[PDB]
Amino acid sequence: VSLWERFCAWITSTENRLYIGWFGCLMFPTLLTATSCFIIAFIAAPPVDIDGIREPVAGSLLYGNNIISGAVVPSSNAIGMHFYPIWEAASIDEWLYNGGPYQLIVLHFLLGVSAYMGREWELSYRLGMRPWIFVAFSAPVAAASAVFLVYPIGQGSFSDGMPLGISGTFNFMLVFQAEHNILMHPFHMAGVAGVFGGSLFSAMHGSLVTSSLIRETTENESTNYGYKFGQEEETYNIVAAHGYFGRLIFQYASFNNSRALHFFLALWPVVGIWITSMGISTMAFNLNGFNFNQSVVDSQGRVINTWADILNRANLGIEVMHERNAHNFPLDLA
């Protein structure tokens, strides 16, 4: 009867086209502002002093870029970790010079993605679902907050944060290799196993369902039209695909349970990306990966090279060349 109850009834209605919910009250204003500023800053945005040395790096399309090289540049080294909104900038020209829109996009992104995650919970509550799709979405939220939030914190500047682009991503990955040795760190190892394993069990499960489909169509029409939507009959012989994989490797390595099978597809990647995103986090605070340089010696004591020493000389090439003007002192403490 009241105005608030007629507003709570609408905002929590599943009869809307898109469910809004109470998290959409701060998902939609956040992500539309992260979007509408990203499209403008990617297309039309002046160059940005990223190294704090007043050498402005172009990143937008109107200043001679493309899809690959164009990128929303991170904020300045001069700012660093300080909060830099528009009203604390004394003009928009001073805001866009010093890496303004990187903080406006990222902070409205991480609020909107952490609200998109809670929104996946909310609709599962109002639909009668068991709730935990949003726990599986915690794994890219862990990884998005690792390269945009946690790594600028432990390194003390948003300038070490990830550039919102495509070539800026590979500037981020290579400089992160030289300074932290991520490939030898066992948490990037535990998530390469998460996505190689994840793409394995995806294409391994998706093939054994498509292999054992039941005849419901003719050879002229499509294979997919043998599934009517909302039917109650099972659309594939699960005993058939169990007997196949029960002979392809051996018998006891096969899940006859389809529920425990469809749980292992959700376990393996998500655990692999939780562990990986806490690799960037523990390497944000300079707890680097393994270092086996000069580890094998002869009885005389001369250093015998290994593959890690060849990997070290690739890291030394990126270390002596990243931010080639920003350094003045012999050790990259930042």
Partner: protein, 52 residues
């Protein structure tokens, strides 16, 4: 002035009257239904289905 240690970033006095009239303008909406109810009615559930 960015790195000042001021509460909620309230630099000027005018920003307070923005905050108080934001929480209260929806609080007064909320009290139009969930306010003025019996504050002495209990349940032995995990969850209450009392009224609107």
């Amino acid at each position: 002035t960015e790195g000042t240690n001021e509460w909620f970033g309230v630099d000027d006095l005018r920003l307070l009257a923005v905050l108080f009239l934001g929480h209260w303008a929806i609080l007064s909406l909320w009290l139009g239904s969930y306010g003025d109810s019996n504050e002495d009615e209990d349940f032995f559930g995990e969850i209450d289905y009392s009224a609107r």
